[PDB]
Tab-separated table of C-alpha atoms in Angstrom:
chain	number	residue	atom	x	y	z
I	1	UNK	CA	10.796	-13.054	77.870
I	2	UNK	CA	14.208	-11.994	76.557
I	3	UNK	CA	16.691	-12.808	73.583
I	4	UNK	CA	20.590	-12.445	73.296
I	5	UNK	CA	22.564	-13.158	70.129
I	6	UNK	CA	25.625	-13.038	68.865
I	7	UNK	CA	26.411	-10.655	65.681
I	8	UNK	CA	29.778	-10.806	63.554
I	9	UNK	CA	31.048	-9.163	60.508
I	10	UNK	CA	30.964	-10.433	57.316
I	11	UNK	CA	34.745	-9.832	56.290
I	12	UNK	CA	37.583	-8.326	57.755
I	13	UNK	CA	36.157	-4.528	57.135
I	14	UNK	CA	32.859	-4.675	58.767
I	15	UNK	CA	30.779	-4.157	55.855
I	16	UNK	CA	27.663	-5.211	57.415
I	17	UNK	CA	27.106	-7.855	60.461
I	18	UNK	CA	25.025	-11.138	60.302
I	19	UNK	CA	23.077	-12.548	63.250
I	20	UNK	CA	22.192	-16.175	63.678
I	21	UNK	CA	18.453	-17.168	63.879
I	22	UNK	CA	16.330	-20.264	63.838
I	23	UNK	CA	13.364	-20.733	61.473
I	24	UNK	CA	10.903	-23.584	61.091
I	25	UNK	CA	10.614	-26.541	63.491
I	26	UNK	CA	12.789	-28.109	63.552
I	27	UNK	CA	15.011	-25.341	63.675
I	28	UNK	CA	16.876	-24.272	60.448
I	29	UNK	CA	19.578	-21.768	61.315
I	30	UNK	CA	20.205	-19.079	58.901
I	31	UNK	CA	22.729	-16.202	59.131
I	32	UNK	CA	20.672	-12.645	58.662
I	33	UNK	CA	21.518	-9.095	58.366
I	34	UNK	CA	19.906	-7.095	60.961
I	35	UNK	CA	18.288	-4.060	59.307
I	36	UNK	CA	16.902	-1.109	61.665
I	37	UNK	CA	16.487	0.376	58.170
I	38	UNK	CA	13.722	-1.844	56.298
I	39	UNK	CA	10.890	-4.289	57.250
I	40	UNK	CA	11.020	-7.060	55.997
I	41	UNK	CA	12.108	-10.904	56.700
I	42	UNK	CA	13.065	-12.585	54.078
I	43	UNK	CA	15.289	-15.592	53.035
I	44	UNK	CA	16.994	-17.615	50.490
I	45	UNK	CA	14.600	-20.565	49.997
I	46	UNK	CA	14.209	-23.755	48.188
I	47	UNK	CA	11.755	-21.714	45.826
I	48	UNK	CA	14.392	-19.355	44.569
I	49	UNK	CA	15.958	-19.910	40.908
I	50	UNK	CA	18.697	-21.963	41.296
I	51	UNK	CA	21.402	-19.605	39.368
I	52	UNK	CA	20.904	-17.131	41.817
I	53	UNK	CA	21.702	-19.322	44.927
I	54	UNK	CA	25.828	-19.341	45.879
I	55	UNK	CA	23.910	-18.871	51.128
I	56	UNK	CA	22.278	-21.639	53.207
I	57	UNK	CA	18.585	-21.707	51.871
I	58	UNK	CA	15.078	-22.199	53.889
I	59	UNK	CA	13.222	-25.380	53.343
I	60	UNK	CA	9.293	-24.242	54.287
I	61	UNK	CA	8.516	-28.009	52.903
I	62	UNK	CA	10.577	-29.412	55.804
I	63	UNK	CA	8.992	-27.313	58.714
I	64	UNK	CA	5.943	-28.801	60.007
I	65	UNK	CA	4.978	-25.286	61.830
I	66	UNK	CA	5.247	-23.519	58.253
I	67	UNK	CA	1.693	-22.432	56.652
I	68	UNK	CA	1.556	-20.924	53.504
I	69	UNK	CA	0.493	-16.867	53.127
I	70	UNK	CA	-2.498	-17.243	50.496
I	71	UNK	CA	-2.288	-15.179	48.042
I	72	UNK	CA	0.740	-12.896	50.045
I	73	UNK	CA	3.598	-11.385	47.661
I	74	UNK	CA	6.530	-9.100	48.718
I	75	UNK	CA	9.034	-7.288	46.160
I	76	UNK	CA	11.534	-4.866	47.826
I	77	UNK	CA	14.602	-2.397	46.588
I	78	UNK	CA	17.433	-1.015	48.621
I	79	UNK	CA	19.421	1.830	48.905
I	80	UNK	CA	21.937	0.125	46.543
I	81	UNK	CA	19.955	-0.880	43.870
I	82	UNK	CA	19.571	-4.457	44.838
I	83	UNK	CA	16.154	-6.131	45.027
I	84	UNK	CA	14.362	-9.349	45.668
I	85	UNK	CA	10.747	-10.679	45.740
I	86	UNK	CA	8.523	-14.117	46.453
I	87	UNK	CA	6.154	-15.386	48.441
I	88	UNK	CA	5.019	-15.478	52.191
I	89	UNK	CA	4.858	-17.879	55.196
I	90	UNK	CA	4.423	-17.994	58.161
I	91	UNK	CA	6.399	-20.006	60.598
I	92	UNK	CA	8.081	-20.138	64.620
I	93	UNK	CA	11.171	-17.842	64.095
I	94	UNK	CA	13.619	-17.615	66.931
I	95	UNK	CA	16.552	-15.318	68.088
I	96	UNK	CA	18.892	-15.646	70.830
I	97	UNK	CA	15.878	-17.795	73.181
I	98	UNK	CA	13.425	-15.350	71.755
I	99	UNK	CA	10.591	-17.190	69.964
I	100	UNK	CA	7.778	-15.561	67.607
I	101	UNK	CA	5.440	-18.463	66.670
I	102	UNK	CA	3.519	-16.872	63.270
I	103	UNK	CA	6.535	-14.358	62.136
I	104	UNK	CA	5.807	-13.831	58.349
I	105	UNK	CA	8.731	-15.278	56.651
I	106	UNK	CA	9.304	-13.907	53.093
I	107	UNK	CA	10.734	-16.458	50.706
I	108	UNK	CA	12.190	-14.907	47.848
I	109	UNK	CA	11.705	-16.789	44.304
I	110	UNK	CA	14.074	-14.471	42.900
I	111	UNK	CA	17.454	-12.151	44.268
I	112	UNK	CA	19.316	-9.817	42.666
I	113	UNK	CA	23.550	-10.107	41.357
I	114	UNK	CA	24.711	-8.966	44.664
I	115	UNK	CA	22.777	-11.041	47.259
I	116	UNK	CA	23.937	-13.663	45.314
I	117	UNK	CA	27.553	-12.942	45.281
I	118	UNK	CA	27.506	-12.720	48.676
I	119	UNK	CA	27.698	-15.935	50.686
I	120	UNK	CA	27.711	-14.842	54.083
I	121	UNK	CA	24.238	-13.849	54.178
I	122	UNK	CA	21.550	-15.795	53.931
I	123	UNK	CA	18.766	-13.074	54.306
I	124	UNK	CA	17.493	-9.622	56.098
I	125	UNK	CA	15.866	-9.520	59.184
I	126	UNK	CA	14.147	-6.034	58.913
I	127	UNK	CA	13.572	-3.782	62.196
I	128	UNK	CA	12.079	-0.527	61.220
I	129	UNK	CA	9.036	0.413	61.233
I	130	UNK	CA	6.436	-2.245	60.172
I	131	UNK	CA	4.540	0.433	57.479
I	132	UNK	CA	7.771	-0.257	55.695
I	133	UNK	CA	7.098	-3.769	54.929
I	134	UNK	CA	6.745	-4.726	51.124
I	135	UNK	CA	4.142	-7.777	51.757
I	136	UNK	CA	1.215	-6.993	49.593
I	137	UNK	CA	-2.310	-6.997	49.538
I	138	UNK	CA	-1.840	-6.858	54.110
I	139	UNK	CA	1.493	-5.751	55.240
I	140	UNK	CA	3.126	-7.943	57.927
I	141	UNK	CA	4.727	-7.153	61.275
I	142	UNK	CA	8.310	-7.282	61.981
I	143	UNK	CA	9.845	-10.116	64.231
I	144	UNK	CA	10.199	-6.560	67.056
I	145	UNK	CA	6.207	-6.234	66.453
I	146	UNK	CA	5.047	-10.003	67.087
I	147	UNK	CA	7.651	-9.744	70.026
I	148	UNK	CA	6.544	-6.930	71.892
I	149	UNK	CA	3.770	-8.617	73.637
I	150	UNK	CA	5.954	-11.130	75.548
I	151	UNK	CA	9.450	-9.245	76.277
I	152	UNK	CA	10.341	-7.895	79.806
I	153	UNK	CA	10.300	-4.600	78.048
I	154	UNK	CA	9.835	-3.254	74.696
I	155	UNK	CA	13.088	-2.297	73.625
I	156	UNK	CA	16.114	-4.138	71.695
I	157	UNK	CA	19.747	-3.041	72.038
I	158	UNK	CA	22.481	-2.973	69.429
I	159	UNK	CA	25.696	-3.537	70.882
I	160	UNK	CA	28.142	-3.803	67.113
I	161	UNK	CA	32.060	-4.800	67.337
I	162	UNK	CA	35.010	-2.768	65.494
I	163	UNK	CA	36.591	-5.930	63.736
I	164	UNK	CA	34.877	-8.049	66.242
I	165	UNK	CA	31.827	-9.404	67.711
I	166	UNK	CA	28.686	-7.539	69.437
I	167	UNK	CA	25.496	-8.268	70.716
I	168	UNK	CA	21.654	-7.346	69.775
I	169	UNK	CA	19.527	-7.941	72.689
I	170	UNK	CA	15.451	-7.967	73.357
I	171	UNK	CA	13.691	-7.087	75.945
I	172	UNK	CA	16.497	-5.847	78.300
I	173	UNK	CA	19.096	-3.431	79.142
I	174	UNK	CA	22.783	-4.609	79.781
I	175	UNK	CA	23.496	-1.939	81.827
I	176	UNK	CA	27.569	-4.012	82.118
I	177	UNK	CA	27.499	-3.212	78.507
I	178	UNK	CA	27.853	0.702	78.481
I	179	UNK	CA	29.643	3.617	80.665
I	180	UNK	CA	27.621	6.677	81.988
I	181	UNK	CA	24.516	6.451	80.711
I	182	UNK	CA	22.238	6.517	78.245
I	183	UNK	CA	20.105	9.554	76.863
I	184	UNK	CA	17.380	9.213	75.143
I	185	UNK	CA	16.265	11.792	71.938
I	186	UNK	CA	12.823	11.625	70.043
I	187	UNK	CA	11.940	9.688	67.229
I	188	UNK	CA	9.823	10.576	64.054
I	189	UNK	CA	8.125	7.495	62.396
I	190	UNK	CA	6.667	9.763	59.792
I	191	UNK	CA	8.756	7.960	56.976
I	192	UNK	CA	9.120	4.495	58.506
I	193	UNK	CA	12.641	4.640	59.731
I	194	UNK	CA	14.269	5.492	63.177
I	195	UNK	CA	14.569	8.789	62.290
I	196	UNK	CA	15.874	11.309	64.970
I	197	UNK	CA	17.972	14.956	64.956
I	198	UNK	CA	21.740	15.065	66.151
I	199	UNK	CA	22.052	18.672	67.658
I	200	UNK	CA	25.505	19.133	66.433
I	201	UNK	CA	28.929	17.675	65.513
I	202	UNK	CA	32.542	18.430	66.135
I	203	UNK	CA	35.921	17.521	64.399
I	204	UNK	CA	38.845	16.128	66.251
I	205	UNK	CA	39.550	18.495	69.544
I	206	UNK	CA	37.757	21.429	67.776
I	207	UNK	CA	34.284	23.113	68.675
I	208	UNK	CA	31.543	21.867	69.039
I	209	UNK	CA	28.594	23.671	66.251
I	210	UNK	CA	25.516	23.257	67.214
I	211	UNK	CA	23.251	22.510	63.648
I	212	UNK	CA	20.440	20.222	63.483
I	213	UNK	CA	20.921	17.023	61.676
I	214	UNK	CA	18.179	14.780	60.528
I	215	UNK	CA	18.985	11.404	60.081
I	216	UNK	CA	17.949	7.745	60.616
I	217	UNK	CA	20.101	5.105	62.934
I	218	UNK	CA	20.350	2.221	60.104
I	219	UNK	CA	22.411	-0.815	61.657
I	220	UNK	CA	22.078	-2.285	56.993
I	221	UNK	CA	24.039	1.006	55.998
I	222	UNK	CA	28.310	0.298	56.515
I	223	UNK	CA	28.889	4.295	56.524
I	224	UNK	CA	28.263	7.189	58.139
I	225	UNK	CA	26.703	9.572	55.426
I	226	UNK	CA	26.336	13.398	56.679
I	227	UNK	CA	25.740	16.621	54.551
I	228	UNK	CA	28.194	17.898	52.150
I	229	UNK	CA	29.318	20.922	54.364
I	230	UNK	CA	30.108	18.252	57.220
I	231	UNK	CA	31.808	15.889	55.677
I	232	UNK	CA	34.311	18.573	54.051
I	233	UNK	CA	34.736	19.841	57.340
I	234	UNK	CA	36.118	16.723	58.605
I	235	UNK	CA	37.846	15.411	55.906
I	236	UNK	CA	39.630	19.531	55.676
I	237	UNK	CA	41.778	18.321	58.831
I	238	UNK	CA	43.459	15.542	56.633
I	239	UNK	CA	46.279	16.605	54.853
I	240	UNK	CA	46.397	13.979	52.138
I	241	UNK	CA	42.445	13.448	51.867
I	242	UNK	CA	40.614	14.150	48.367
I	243	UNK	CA	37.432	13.478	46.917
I	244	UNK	CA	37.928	10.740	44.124
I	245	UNK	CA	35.420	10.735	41.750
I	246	UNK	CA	36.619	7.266	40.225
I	247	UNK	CA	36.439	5.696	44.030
I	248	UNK	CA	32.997	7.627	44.718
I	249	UNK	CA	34.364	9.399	48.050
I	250	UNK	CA	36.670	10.382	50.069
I	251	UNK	CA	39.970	8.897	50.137
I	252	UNK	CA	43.349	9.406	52.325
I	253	UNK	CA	46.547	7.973	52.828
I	254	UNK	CA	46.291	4.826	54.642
I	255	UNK	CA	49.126	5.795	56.894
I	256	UNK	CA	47.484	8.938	58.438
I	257	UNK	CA	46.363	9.165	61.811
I	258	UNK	CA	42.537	10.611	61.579
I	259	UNK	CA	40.645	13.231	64.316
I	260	UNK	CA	37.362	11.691	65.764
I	261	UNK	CA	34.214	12.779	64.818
I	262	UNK	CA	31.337	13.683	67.398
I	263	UNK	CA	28.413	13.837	67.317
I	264	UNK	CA	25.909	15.059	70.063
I	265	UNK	CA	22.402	13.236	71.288
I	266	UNK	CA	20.297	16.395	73.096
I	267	UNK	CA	22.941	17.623	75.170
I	268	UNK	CA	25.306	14.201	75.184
I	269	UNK	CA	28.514	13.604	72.496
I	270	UNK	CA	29.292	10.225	71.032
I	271	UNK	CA	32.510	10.403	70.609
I	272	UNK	CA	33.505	8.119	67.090
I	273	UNK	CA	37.212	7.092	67.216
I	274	UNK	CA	39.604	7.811	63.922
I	275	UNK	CA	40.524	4.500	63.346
I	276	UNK	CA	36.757	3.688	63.207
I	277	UNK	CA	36.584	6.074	60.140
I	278	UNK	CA	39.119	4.436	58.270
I	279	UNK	CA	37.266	1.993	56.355
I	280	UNK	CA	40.179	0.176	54.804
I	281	UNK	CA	42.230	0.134	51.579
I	282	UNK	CA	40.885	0.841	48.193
I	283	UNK	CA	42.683	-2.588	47.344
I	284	UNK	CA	45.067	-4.961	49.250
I	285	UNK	CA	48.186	-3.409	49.274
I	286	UNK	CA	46.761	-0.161	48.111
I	287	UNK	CA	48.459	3.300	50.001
I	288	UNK	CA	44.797	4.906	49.883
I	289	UNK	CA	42.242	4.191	51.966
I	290	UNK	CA	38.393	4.624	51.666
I	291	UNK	CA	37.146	7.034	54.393
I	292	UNK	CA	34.397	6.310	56.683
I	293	UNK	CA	32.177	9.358	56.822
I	294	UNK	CA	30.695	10.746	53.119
I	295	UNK	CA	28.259	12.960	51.801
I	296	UNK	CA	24.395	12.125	52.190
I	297	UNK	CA	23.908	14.946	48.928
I	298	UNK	CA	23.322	11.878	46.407
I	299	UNK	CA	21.253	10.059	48.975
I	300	UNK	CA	18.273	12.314	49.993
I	301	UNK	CA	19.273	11.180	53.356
I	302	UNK	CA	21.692	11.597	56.489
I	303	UNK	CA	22.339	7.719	57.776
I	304	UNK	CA	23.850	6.518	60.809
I	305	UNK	CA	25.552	3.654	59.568
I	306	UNK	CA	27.285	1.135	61.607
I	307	UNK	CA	30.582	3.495	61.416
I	308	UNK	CA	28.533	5.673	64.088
I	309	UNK	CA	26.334	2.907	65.669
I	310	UNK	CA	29.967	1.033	66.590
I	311	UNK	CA	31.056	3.517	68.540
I	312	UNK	CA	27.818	3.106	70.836
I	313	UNK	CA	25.278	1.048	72.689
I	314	UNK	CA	22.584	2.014	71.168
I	315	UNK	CA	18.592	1.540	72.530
I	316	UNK	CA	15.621	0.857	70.284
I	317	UNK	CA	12.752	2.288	72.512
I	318	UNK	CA	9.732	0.510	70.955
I	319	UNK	CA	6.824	1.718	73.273
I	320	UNK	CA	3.997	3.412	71.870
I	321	UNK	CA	5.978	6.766	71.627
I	322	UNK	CA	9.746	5.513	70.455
I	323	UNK	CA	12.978	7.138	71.096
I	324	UNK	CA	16.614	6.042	70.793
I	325	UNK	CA	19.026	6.242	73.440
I	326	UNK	CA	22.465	6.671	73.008
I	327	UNK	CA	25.308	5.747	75.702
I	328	UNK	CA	29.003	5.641	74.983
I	329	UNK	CA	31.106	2.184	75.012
C-alpha cells in the first residue's frame, strides 16, 4: 500500500506546514503538523479545557472504531517551550489512502498559550523515532511504525513548497519529483531523531570547506540552525546584516539580494537558494528582514529545518538500518 497528501503552509512565511488526515470512523479530518522531529500523535479533543481551544477538535465519543488506552498518559515539551498532555486511544487513522487501523491517538486534556493561539493546526503528527514517544507506562509507535508492514516500501518522502504546496508520500519514490538523483548518508538513532553528518558547506560561489556537521533533518523546526562559526560566515557576505539581540538573530535589509548556502550529503551539494533564506520582515512594512539560517549555540543542536528541507526531496529510509537521501528539486 501507498499514501499521498497534500501539505501547505500555515501563513504567508512558511512557518511550519500542516497535512490533512482522517481519524475515527467515520472519518474526522484534522489539519496536523508533520514532525520528523518528535513522536507523538496527538490532537485537540473534546476532552481538552475549553479556554484553551481557538483548531477543529477530535470527538473519540463519535468514532465507533475508537477504544480507550487504559490507564495510558502522554505529557510532551518542545524545543520552544510549549507543551501539552492527556490521554490515549486508539483508533483507524488515515493519510493520503494510507490507513493504520490501531494508531495510538493522543488526546490532549490540556495545551499550552501557543497551540492555542494558533488556529491552523489542529495537532502533531510525530515521525521520529518511536523511543521518542511521551506515552507512559508502554510507549506507542508512530503512524511510520504501524505502517511499515503494509507499504510497497518502507520509506516516506518529504517533498515541502517555498510559499506553496508540497507533498509527503509513503511507501514510494516519485522519481518525476526530483532531478539527478538521490544519495543516501547514514543515520544515527542513538538520540531518537534523524540524525545524520553534512560533510561540509559553502557560501554563495565561494569554496567549498569540508567540516563535519551533526545535525538532525526536522520537517517541525522553520529554520536552518548551524554553528556559530557558520552562520557568521554566511551572514559576513551581507553588507547590511547584524546580529540583533532584541530580534534574537540575524537580521538584513529586506532589499538585499542574499548568496545561497550549500550544503553537501557524502560527496553531493544541496544547493539552498537566497531568497529561501530570507524569512520575511521583522514587521509588515518593516525595511529589516529576519534571516533564515542562525546559530544552533543556544540550542545544543544543529537542525535542518524546513529552510534546508525546501530546497530538497528528501527520503526517510525506514528499513531496519535508516538513512536519508537527499536529491535536489
Amino acid at each position: 500500500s501507498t499514501g499521498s497528501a497534500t501539505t501547505t503552509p500555515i501563513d504567508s512565511l512558511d512557518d511550519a506546514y500542516i497535512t490533512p488526515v482522517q481519524i475515527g470512523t467515520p472519518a474526522q479530518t484534522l489539519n496536523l503538523d508533520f514532525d520528523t522531529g518528535s513522536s507523538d500523535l496527538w490532537v485537540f479533543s473534546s476532552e481538552t479545557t475549553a479556554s484553551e481551544v481557538x483548531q477543529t477538535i477530535y470527538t473519540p465519543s463519535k468514532s465507533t472504531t475508537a477504544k480507550l488506552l487504559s490507564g495510558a498518559t502522554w505529557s510532551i515539551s518542545y524545543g520552544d517551550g510549549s507543551s501539552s498532555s492527556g490521554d490515549v486511544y486508539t483508533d483507524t487513522v488515515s493519510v493520503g489512502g494510507l490507513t493504520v487501523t490501531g494508531q495510538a491517538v493522543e488526546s490532549a486534556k490540556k495545551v499550552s498559550s501557543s497551540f492555542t493561539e494558533d488556529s491552523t493546526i489542529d495537532g502533531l503528527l510525530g515521525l521520529a523515532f518511536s523511543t521518542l514517544n511521551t506515552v507512559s507506562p508502554t510507549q506507542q509507535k508512530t503512524f511510520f511504525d504501524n505502517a511499515k508492514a503494509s507499504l510497497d516500501s518502507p520509506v516516506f518522502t518529504a517533498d515541502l513548497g517555498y510559499h506553496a504546496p508540497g507533498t509527503y508520500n509513503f511507501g514510494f519514490i516519485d522519481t518525476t519529483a526530483y532531478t539527478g538523483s538521490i544519495t543516501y548518508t547514514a543515520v544515527s538513532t542513538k538520540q531518537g531523531f534523524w540524525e545524520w553528518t553534512s560533510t561540509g558547506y559553502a557560501v554563495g560561489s565561494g569554496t567549498f570547506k569540508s567540516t563535519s556537521i551533526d545535525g538532525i533533518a526536522d520537517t517541525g523546526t522553520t529554520l536552518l540552525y548551524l554553528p556559530a562559526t557558520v552562520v557568521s560566515a554566511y551572514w559576513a557576505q551581507v553588507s547590511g546584516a547584524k546580529s540583533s539581540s532584541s530580534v534574537g538573530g540575524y537580521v538584513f535589509p529586506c532589499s538585499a539580494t542574499l548568496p545561497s548556502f550549500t550544503f553537501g550529503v557524502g560527496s553531493a551539494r544541496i544547493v539552498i537558494p537566497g531568497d529561501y533564506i530570507d524569512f520575511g520582515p521583522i514587521s509588515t512594512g518593516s525595511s529589516s528582514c529576519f534571516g533564515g539560517i542562525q546559530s544552533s549555540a543556544g540550542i545544543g543542536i544543529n537542525i535542518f529545518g524546513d529552510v534546508a528541507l525546501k530546497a530538497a526531496f528528501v527520503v526517510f529510509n525506514g528499513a531496519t538500518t535508516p538513512t536519508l537521501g537527499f536529491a535536489s528539486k
